[PDB]
């Protein structure tokens, strides 16, 4: 409940299995309250305007986030995490890519389709600049 | 055939222990001279990258490390570097060349951790991001003696 949409946009992501493919994916990031505990939650939803069976999501609470900031050396707290992610996605690189090969979003699919890994990057002159990778589960 | 690629005085945050037998490390902002040079190994002829840290405050303050391609591969692995050994110095140096137009008319970005016996010091370089400290790499430098 108390679901506030913070980001809802179609992005170009390169999909992986091991042949790569740049495809359009809908990413939704929203704020919600856990029904039993009332605690703040962050929900990530990935879907495709073509594949209807392509539905993945993950809900993060503060505990789940601590694992994510441990694995990716994030210094931002759970509250600021979506603000800096959404700022990166919407405000930072306003570069239009002509579509009738590098991507800042990588999606790695499971052969069984039980999940997928959603990866966000901010390239640097010396590294790929991985921000975080989140495991999204089949809906 | 040693060539100095970078030679500048930088502000670093220095951590040094009270003693070899005590937990306490005290922290200081201090000016250190960093020198990055390229050279050829005398026996093998292979390309080497040398890092040297010194400071006018203490003639006994002399640390260095020489990286060859193999040593670098370990460093690249530990810090997820995607640039090759040849490009590494050019990129790091281009990063360090900082025109601060902060014409006044304290985040450091360099951390140095010392040994109690002064046998080594860990040199760490950072480029802050909105979500992280942005560690570029850390290099263990050894006492020059």
Curated annotation (Swiss-Prot), chain B:
It is found in: Cytoplasm; Cytoplasm, Cytoskeleton, Microtubule organizing center, Centrosome, Centriole. GO terms for biological process: centriole assembly; centriole replication; centrosome duplication; protein localization; regulation of cell cycle. Transmembrane segments: none annotated. GO terms for molecular function: identical protein binding; protein domain specific binding. GO terms for cellular component: centriole; centrosome; cytoplasm. The keyword Coiled coil applies. Disruption phenotype: RNAi-mediated knockdown results in failed centrosome duplication in embryos. Keywords: Cell cycle, Coiled coil, Cytoplasm, Cytoskeleton, Developmental protein. Disulfide bonds: none annotated. Its main location: cytoplasm. Residues 44-96 form the PISA domain. Central scaffolding component of the centrioles ensuring their 9-fold symmetry. Required for centrosome biogenesis and duplication. Nine homodimers form a cartwheel structure with an internal diameter of 23 nM and radial spokes connecting to the microtubule triplets. Interacts with sas-5. The coiled coil domain is necessary and sufficient for interaction with sas-5. This is Spindle assembly abnormal protein 6. It comes from Caenorhabditis elegans. The chain holds residues 3 to 168 of 492 of the full protein.
């Amino acid at each position: 409940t108390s679901k506030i949409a913070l980001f809802d946009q179609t992005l170009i992501a390169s999909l992986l299995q091991f042949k790569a493919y740049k495809t359009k994916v809908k990413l939704k990031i929203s704020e919600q309250r856990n029904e039993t505990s009332g605690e703040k939650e962050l929900k990530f939803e990935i879907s495709r305007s073509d594949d209807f069976e392509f539905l993945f999501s993950e809900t993060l609470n503060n505990e789940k986030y601590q694992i994510l900031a441990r694995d990716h050396d994030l210094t931002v707290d759970f509250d600021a995490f979506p603000k800096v992610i959404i700022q990166h996605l919407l405000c930072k690189n306003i570069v239009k890519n002509l579509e009738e090969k590098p991507t800042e979003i990588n999606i790695i699919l499971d052969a069984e389709k039980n999940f997928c890994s959603f990866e966000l990057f901010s390239k640097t002159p010396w590294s790929k600049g991985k921000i975080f990778s989140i495991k999204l589960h089949a809906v």
